[PDB]
Amino acid sequence: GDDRELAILATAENLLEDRPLADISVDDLAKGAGISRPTFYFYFPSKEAVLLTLLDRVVNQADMALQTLAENPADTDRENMWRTGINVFFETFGSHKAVTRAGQAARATSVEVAELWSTFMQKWIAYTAAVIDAERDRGAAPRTLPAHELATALNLMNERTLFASFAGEQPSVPEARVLDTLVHIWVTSIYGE
Amino acid sequence: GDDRELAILATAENLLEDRPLADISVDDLAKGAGISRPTFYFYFPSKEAVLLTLLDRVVNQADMALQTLAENPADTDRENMWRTGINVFFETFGSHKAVTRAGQAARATSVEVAELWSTFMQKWIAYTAAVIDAERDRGAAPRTLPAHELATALNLMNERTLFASFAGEQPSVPEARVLDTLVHIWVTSIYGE
Ligand SMILES: COc1ccc(NC(=O)N2CCC(C)CC2)cc1
Ligand SMILES: COc1ccc(NC(=O)N2CCC(C)CC2)cc1
């Protein structure tokens, strides 16, 4: 079970580097995984379900990395604190660009992909707002915008900006500049009065 | 010519308030415009071409409003200067939410829609960077990030945040909060050291 499922998922991630999900057949997935087509349908109903599982894996990888960071004591340097956090997403999604690209596109056509992304964005926004609230409570950040509203716009900026950078969209921030760009906007907007 | 073309465009904008372009037929468009199907094909090749023209109209409306603002002397109050500028996009796109929603979705499936949006984003980013550069030259803004990179992330934030707000996505900034939210992040990031 585990082994043939993992092989299908690995094959899908590899083929999505070359082409979009529309141009990948179940035959391609079964062939890559060394199984028959009917055996593929035992593990997944569709190529779309495979992408959902890949995206779920990547999103939970980012979330579990963020939880690991949240568990350790807080970085005493506020800019570095936020940079290490944004970097979890930069490195996790940047290490899975094909799944990232395909998953964002699938939000349009898949309610399960749209709901997965929504769910995790709400969790990441809530956490961001809780950190901003803690910074205000300790007198390290000014009481300016509603923290949850600020957190929402900053998280949406990172969603759009990181995906544009990884896809090489025109326009985009160069990948080698995007972490510095986003940290600057987070720190100035969280700590600026 | 002008009159039947305008009627098709008006019908399309009206029907997109009720449903997506996928659920609107050429019959629906011709019927709404008081023409036959074959007469529709004289003016446009597809329902997709109608949406392209609607989006083109809206994007050029925003751009021409921004040009009008760019022509007048600069607002002496830096926060108000940026607020009046962001408000051009808030009001223009917010007044055409059905075309906005349908056009953003069509970027996925239409190279002409994707190129239209890209073209105008590059123009708006260039203008933003030129204003930031002028603010630095006059000693009103600090020389922090590369202006074009800062401008790119701020414009992508507005793209994603305003569209989420107008679509009522979860998550989103409430529409009644989104202008204040974005102005705060632009002003703190442009003027913060
Ligand atoms: C590609 O999509 C996203 C990429 C990044 C984000 N969010 C973040 O960077 N953080 C920064 C650190 C914070 C404590 C949690 C949120 C959201 C979406
Ligand atoms: C919905 O998509 C966008 C909505 C807004 C923008 N950009 C802007 O707000 N401005 C602010 C003022 C500046 C001088 C030009 C750019 C881009 C995309």
Descriptive notes:
The structure is a homodimer of 193-residue chains. With 193 residues, chain A is mainly alpha-helical. Chain A folds into 2 domains: 46 residues, no CATH class; 147 residues, no CATH class. Helix content of chain A is 77%, strand content 0%. The first copy, chain A, is built from 9 helices and no strands. The relative contact order of chain A is 0.11. The site of one ~{N}-(4-methoxyphenyl)-4-methyl-piperidine-1-carboxamide (UAZ) has 13 residues of chain B, from helix 5, helix 7 and helix 8. Chains A, B: Pfam families: EthR_C (PF21313), TetR_N (PF00440). Chains A, B: This is HTH-type transcriptional regulator EthR.
Summary, kept brief:
Chain A has 193 residues and is an all-alpha fold. Chain A has helices at residues 2-18, 26-33, 37-43, 47-71, 78-94, 97-106, 111-137, 147-167, 175-191.
